[PDB]
Design an enzyme around this catalytic site. Structure first.
Site, PDB file in Angstrom:
ATOM      1  N   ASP A 101       0.829  -1.212   0.000  1.00  0.00           N
ATOM      2  CA  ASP A 101       0.000   0.000   0.000  1.00  0.00           C
ATOM      3  C   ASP A 101       0.866   1.266   0.000  1.00  0.00           C
ATOM      4  OD1 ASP A 101      -1.535  -0.826   3.310  1.00  0.00           O
ATOM      5  OD2 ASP A 101       0.591  -0.678   2.632  1.00  0.00           O
ATOM      6  N   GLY A 130      -6.086  12.660   2.220  1.00  0.00           N
ATOM      7  CA  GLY A 130      -6.272  13.395   0.973  1.00  0.00           C
ATOM      8  C   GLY A 130      -6.983  12.510  -0.022  1.00  0.00           C
ATOM      9  N   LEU A 131      -6.525  11.264  -0.149  1.00  0.00           N
ATOM     10  CA  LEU A 131      -7.162  10.302  -1.036  1.00  0.00           C
ATOM     11  C   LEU A 131      -8.597   9.999  -0.609  1.00  0.00           C
ATOM     12  CD1 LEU A 131      -6.915   8.840  -3.532  1.00  0.00           C
ATOM     13  CD2 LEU A 131      -5.814   6.904  -2.381  1.00  0.00           C
TER      14      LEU A 131
END
Ligand code: SF4
Ligand code: SF4
EC number: 1.3.7.7
Lengths: 415, 420, 420, 414
Positions: free
Chosen positions: C274, C409-410
């Protein structure tokens, strides 16, 4: 060194690490704005969807699961009454929904809970504002993207009938891509063309004896089957991945529709250059690298075909959850000969093949990737490749991107 | 039939998976459908693990109906043994397999392997993850623990810690060191970082520290008879809770309570002048039974919030909660429906929520500060940095975690207030 | 005259204040106007201190013009000695007093107290806080350090840590730990948690560990002559940085480099899957000279970002930076104007900014993820929880700190994209 | 038991812990929508405003400091060209500004650099689109809230001239409060009524021989002086803190404008009960408690006057940075007799007088508050009371509240 049609496919069974067809809902729901996918299953089913939808779960997605409770097991006449009124309660709570899908699970099927009458009755009770269909996504019938197939196919028998000869492009695609696709097909001169599935339920494509359709996605066996059974005839094409993919894909429709190489080259010229260049940025890191792909999505063949051909990777073992021989034919023609094919899987056998293989890049599910990364093999988790825009010309770079990056990062992390 | 979007708990076989993974040299076989191996993802991504979970499946499909299925679990058990060679094993049914005939006892017995193979009772239509965790661990301790002579020195076990446990890693760490400050060394921490070999060596420790009631209290209970072991009832989250946990331990061991408070910064922080506007900010508390009872004592007695709502999603803990909640003039809220939680929070009208990933999300929706105090939780909350909840450093973490969303809230209010 | 809203640094007397407070049993007397005692507030609030800063003022006002002013500093020094009885003292002028005639040497000489009283040169119109910190500390070491026979065992000092130091508390902790892992125990950490008494006992340690160039390199230099002590040049922020620091230490002491890597989680975290989309996200880095050079190695070589901007406000460190920056194919940005920083960030167009409370706010204004890596900083960054930057656990903190704004943010992009 | 007019005030000198008048800009830039406050001072001055403005600094506040650089010390002619340029820069790069305050620091004044003529000169160059005034905020000249006074008094000699008999409420107020005040004063029958400072420059109160004015704030020595010099008559009244304060304050105006004791009792009735009740909530924790107040704002006396009378607190030592005999009179008369009074301070002497007193609640600055909490005394930090709405009726609850909260918290943590 480029041809695979007569390769013997390892038809394999055993222990599996794949997603059931339910997972597919997670991404379908988005394209079909008008629809709700109501799984009838267990808390295992609910928890799965949760895990697979990550953050999307908080965005009031339009799917959910009627979780079978202890008192639903015995007395299977309650099953219909229970659901009926759980459905209405949902159809009041979101009136905008127009297609309701009763998605069936393993639990729902062990109980031979017949979703099909349920689908038909509910359609009457809730007419003609909401039309309710039904298909299977149970792990038993369905692996991952097969869930879109079983869904689409269930919808096909009820589409409006028609005379005219229009193109149907089958496979839910990221929106942006769908438009690029529309655009090019127009400029070739291909008058009215529709998508299955459509963005809304009032603009579902009609089908008839003169309808032609083409596959945007490899995993559409049954939907092809049902469309053929409505007298519509398929168009064969390798899947639109890479510049070579997209081109041949276009070329195939071009041919069937009587379009001069003239209009073809002049349309297709500009965008093919774009692609070839964008792709080139990745050649450095990617050429010569050996690729291993576990089964997940049925996308592994044509992706391996793009990776080897346009990126110059060397295919080791390419593995798919199902292998529709007739559909996969064009891409198998273009796939390197030295390539072991596997339909299905015996995880342990496979993991043992790959250990002593030691490939460069390894494409796989999330429950494998880290274990494999800790062992020193580089990984590129596969799920990404359904939902990221990857088809057609504009996304060609980004597609190659997705496979360069993991290797770029590996080097970077030790000099 | 319950219409279900969010679930707070997995089905019980995850709880099984969660215990099996916590252990080393232990193989679990789940009889279940093909495609139903998704829980891998949780252990490898959320926990961030480097090997595959020690879990295998029989992976039956549609064209396997007929007694074909018993034979598949057989060869699953066979394969798993041959391949991995684990000190012991355990077998159970996925929810789908619960509706099938094949019996985990009978197939396990018949085949008859060299090592113990434990069959598990997982009612997947009436129970959930947390039960799964407890039973699976009850059953492993029940099968593997035997009476033994106590250690020469004073020792104890850490009961309850697991895979996918919210700050389990670091709580184990933090409790170990606060026990060590009292002269007490740890016998075996289990299920986490324990082998079946180790599970036999349970008997020799004077007492059990029950870390997480929800995950290892049955096991604590079983050990109360087996080797006459008293488990600690007070879970050390917060300073007061920790002091009382230490006093309780002094009571169990005879040993004087020694504390290393040189790094304990929370009391002064909260005593500080910048902490004064915290006074009676209304907080709503939701989460796993144990963390809510802990949070609320901190909230009201260590930070000076007014606890305005209190509840949990695990039935198993409803009475410890209902009890505690009353002490705060409050009626506990026992629910697994998040839509209920949303209703409760709107009713209570708090200024701060403390809950789970779901509550973080409700809080977002409502424009309210929020902190995460309990599972279920995403990757964010299995941090690389040291971040316990228990003990002293844990009390530091908690103060920082909870105060932040509020300070930010103020800074958001102010900055927009003066934009115009 | 330069139009000034935000300043990255205080006037040099805060730097003095900053060094005086770090010490115990030391009194500082500032000749300065009444109303100009505001700095307390930083030490009391931001750092969260429990006693008043050991700092006193002459507190002259309007009706005090005439040589009436020298007399006031006299009786300020007198009163401060009488009252507190500190092992030593130090005296300086605030910027207002720098434009007056009374001189801190001549009045301190005349009066003639029992203990040493060190007069400080603080060009308040030419220099700033960081210089103030260095000089005041140079001056204290220069006056109090004397040659000495080395300790029986191997020892060193920690030079540079102070009051209002960003993560100084925990960095001292973390570095002590990693020295102790190599057999090396610490002689005296100064200025922080040191008395004048202690400053005399400097000579007896083999080497100096220069923790913060910006705050104690003058002192490091002076000690290079005084008791021929070599100071460590590599500051341990990041894993690579820390390994090289440890190697540098093995080179200085002869001792074999031993590491306790059992809690070091950063490498695997960033090695994990990730962490893949982190690859070459464009980061702009700004802050104090030392934290920017450190950040940038981590950013590019340990996390896999593309460093897209690099700069500092501290002109003292411009060359260290300009050198390092070049190695990234970048032109360092040396500015104390935040309006320049805002322009540079817009030109660079990063996906992540790492900087100061100011950069946090620029970032907020531009809707960009952001992490704080360097003073000046508000109360939120003097945490209750353990949070170093240096060494191994420090490396874990940094990874969690920096990734979080991005993952949020994502999560924010995705959720609104989905809404839709 | 209630009267302090003849108490000897300890006029005290020595070591100080207070804010200079610069701090006031913080606080009052907000009220004057039109204005920019440009300190001419050092980086100490810049850093102070930063510290005082906390987070506001990020909100593009309308103030800043032209920080004196090494080359501005010698000589005092370059200085002005330099400033002009910095000011010109500022005025083009935000045309909204309409009044520019040259606020004066210690350094600038020690440099004898004459801001008076500068302000005179800049007005020309940049007229008529900007008026530029000048006043002093230097620690030498000024303590905290005095900053507002010096400013307002610099604005006075320039206001438009008038005949009419309008009321002027002098003191910057939270807008909220400003309206509440305005409203009560209006339905009482008193039109028209202006504020100094005004919200915008184009709506500045005019002053004349028949102007009456009242102080919303106890710290306006010079501004009274200045309004007096233009022929305006003060209206004495205790300051409006608590129900009683606000009542007498209204009463005093209503007297001087000849409002009936009946239109008064009808208008004022509802609000006053709403208040005594809000205060009731705090009466429990507050009655009996001994108060101490270090000097900061000049609001010590009237607030102390409020806390003792309406909240039943024992006063011990109430200290103030400046004590205006004529202005503080109505409050002093209602302040309990057992009360020690200090003007200015000797920090260390106070800290001894305080330790020996061991007060229940101590009202003090941020630099003193924690070391006093760790030492065992409950505190309430002072700066709050300047910026938080606290005047008049609707705010009385919150006001008492500001003081109960800490004591409540101290109990709650043992
Ligand atoms: S439908 Fe089958 S594979 Fe999917 S979650 Fe349910 S039991 Fe598992
Ligand atoms: S007291 Fe004087 S020198 Fe100090 S900050 Fe205020 S105006 Fe500037």
């Amino acid at each position: 060194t480029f041809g695979c049609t007569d390769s013997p496919v390892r038809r394999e069974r055993g222990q599996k690490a794949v997603f059931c067809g339910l997972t597919s809902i997670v991404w379908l729901h988005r394209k079909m704005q008008d629809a709700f996918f109501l799984v009838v299953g267990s808390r295992t089913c609910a928890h799965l969807l949760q895990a697979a939808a990550g953050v999307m779960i908080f965005a009031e997605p339009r799917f959910g699961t009627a979780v079978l409770e202890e008192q639903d097991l015995a007395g299977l006449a309650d099953a219909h009454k229970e659901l009926d009124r759980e459905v209405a309660k949902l159809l009041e709570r979101r009136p905008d929904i127009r297609q309701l899908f009763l998605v069936g699970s393993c639990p729902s099927e062990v109980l031979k809970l017949d979703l099909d009458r349920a689908a038909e009755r509910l359609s009457g009770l809730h007419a003609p504002h909401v039309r309710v269909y039904s298909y299977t996504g149970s792990g038993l019938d369905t692996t991952f993207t097969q869930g879109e197939d079983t869904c689409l196919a269930a919808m096909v028998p009820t589409l409006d009938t028609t005379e005219a000869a229009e193109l149907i492009v089958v496979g839910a695609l990221p929106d942006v891509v769908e438009d690029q696709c529309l655009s090019l097909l127009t400029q070739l001169g291909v008058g009215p063309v529709r998508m299955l599935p459509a963005r809304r339920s009032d603009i579902e494509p009609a089908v008839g004896p003169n309808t032609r359709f083409i596959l945007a996605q490899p995993f559409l066996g049954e939907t092809t089957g049902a469309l053929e059974r409505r007298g519509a005839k398929r168009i064969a094409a390798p899947f639109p991945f890479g510049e070579e993919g997209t081109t041949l894909w276009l070329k195939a429709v071009a041919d069937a529709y009587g379009v001069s190489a003239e209009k073809f080259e002049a349309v297709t010229a500009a965008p093919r250059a774009r692609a070839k260049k964008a792709i080139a940025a990745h050649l450095e890191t990617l050429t010569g690298k050996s690729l291993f792909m576990f089964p997940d999505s049925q996308l592994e063949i044509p992706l391996a075909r793009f990776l080897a051909r346009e990126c110059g990777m060397k295919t080791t073992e390419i593995a798919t959850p199902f292998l529709h021989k007739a559909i996969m034919a064009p891409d198998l023609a273009l796939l390197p000969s030295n390539t072991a094919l596997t339909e299905g899987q015996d995880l342990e056998a496979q993991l043992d093949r790959h250990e002593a293989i030691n490939p460069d890049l390894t494409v796989c599910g999330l429950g494998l990737a880290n274990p494999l990364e800790a062992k020193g093999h580089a990984t590129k988790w596969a799920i990404e490749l359904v939902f990221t825009p990857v088809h057609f010309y504009e996304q060609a770079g980004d597609l190659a991107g997705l496979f360069s990056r993991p290797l770029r990062r590996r080097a970077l992390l030790n000099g | 039939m319950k219409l279900t979007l969010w679930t707070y708990e997995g089905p019980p076989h995850v709880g099984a998976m969660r215990v099996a993974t916590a252990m080393k040299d232990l193989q679990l076989v789940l009889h279940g459908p093909q495609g139903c191996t998704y829980a891998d993802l949780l252990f490898t991504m959320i926990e961030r693990r480097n090997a595959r979970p020690p879990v295998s499946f029989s992976t039956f499909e549609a064209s396997h109906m007929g007694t074909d299925t018993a034979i598949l679990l057989k060869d699953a058990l066979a394969a798993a043994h041959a391949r991995y060679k684990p000190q012991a094993m355990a077998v159970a049914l996925t929810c789908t397999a619960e509706l099938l005939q094949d019996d985990p006892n009978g197939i396990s017995r018949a085949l008859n392997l060299p090592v113990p193979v434990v069959p598990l009772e997982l009612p997947s239509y009436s129970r959930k993850e947390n039960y799964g965790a407890d039973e699976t661990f009850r059953a492993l301790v029940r099968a593997l623990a035997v009476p033994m002579e106590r250690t020469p020195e004073v020792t104890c076990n850490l009961l309850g810690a697991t895979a996918l446990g919210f700050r389990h890693r670091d709580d184990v760490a933090e409790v170990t060191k606060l026990l060590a400050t009292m002269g007490i060394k740890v016998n075996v921490c289990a299920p986490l970082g324990a082998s079946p070999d180790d599970l036999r060596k349970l008997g020799q420790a004077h007492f059990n520290v029950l870390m997480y009631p929800e995950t290892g209290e049955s096991a604590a209970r079983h050990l109360e008879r087996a080797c006459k072991q008293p488990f600690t009832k007070i879970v050390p989250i917060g300073v007061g809770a920790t002091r009382d946990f230490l006093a309780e331990v002094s009571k169990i061991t005879g040993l004087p309570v020694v504390t290393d408070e040189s790094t304990l910064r929370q009391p002064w922080w909260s005593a500080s002048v910048d902490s004064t506007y915290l006074t009676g900010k209304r907080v709503f508390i939701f989460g796993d039974g144990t963390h809510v009872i802990a949070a609320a004592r901190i909230a009201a007695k260590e930070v000076g919030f007014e606890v305005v709502g209190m509840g949990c999603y695990n039935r198993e803990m409803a009475r410890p909660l209902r009890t505690a909640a009353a002490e705060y003039g409050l009626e506990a809220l026992i629910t697994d429906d998040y839509l209920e939680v949303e209703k409760a929070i709107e009713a209570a009208a708090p200024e701060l929520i403390l809950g789970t990933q779901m509550e973080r999300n409700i809080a977002k929706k409502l424009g309210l500060p929020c902190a995460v105090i309990s599972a279920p939780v995403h990757v964010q909350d299995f941090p690389a940095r040291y971040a316990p909840q228990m003990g002293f450093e844990g009390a530091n973490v908690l103060f920082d975690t909870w105060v932040h969303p509020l300070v930010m809230g103020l800074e958001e209010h102010l900055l927009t207030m003066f934009r115009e």
